[PDB]
Each structure stands twice: as C-alpha cells, then as structure tokens.
Design a protein around this ligand. Sequence first.
Ligand code: HEM
Length: 82
Amino acid sequence: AVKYYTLEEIQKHNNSKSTWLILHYKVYDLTKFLEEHPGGEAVLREQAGGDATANFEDVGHSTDARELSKTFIIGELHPDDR
Ligand code: HEM
C-alpha cells in the first residue's frame, strides 16, 4: 500500500519539531537528517514544507546520496495535487 499526503498537510511540517519536503512526488521526513546533511541544515529548512526537486537536481546529488534518501520516504504527493 501507499500513503498519500496533500500539499496542505505537508506545508505544516516546517518547524523545529518536523521537517518534510517533496522530491519527485515523494514525501521525505528529514527531521533527523538535518544535522547529518553534508550540505548543511539551512538549505533543507529553507525548502521545508514544499517541493525542492529542482534545487535538489540543481546541485546534482550523487548516486550514494540518492540511494540514502530512500530511507526517509514516508509517502507520496496526492495525485490531485500533482
Ligand atoms: C533527500 C535528502 C537528501 C539527501 C539524502 C542528501 C544528501 C547529500 C549528500 C550525501 C551530499 C554530499 C554530495 C553527494 O553525495 O551528492 C549532499 C550535498 C549537498 N546537498 Fe543534499 N541531500 C538531500 C537533500 C538536499 C536538498 C533538498 C537540497 C537543497 C534544497 C540539498 C542541498 C545540498 C547541497 C548544497 C550540497 C553541497 C553540494 C556541493 O558542495 O557540491 N540536499 N547532500
């Protein structure tokens, strides 16, 4: 099965308690990854609650980075909001 979230729900997760963002229609919970991110936590908090796909691809993340990102997926963006 798969859990779907709306943009309205995702937008709420951008505080000190929770940080979610969207990448390629998938929802990632990066709350506990903030301090481990090689690119820093500031670049993640700025995109929190929205779609960061372009910025993610813009810096050109490596294969290892993409493989690791999969562990943070909690669902997908609801089809109606795509
Ligand atoms: C899905 C979560 C993400 C993971 C697992 C992740 C992981 C990493 C890793 C492992 C690196 C080191 C270089 C590499 O291996 O490519 C990196 C660098 C970087 N990341 Fe991310 N990243 C994520 C999301 C993002 C997002 C959404 C942004 C921007 C909006 C971002 C901005 C950067 C920046 C600025 C660097 C530095 C690149 C450089 O110095 O060339 N990352 N990230």
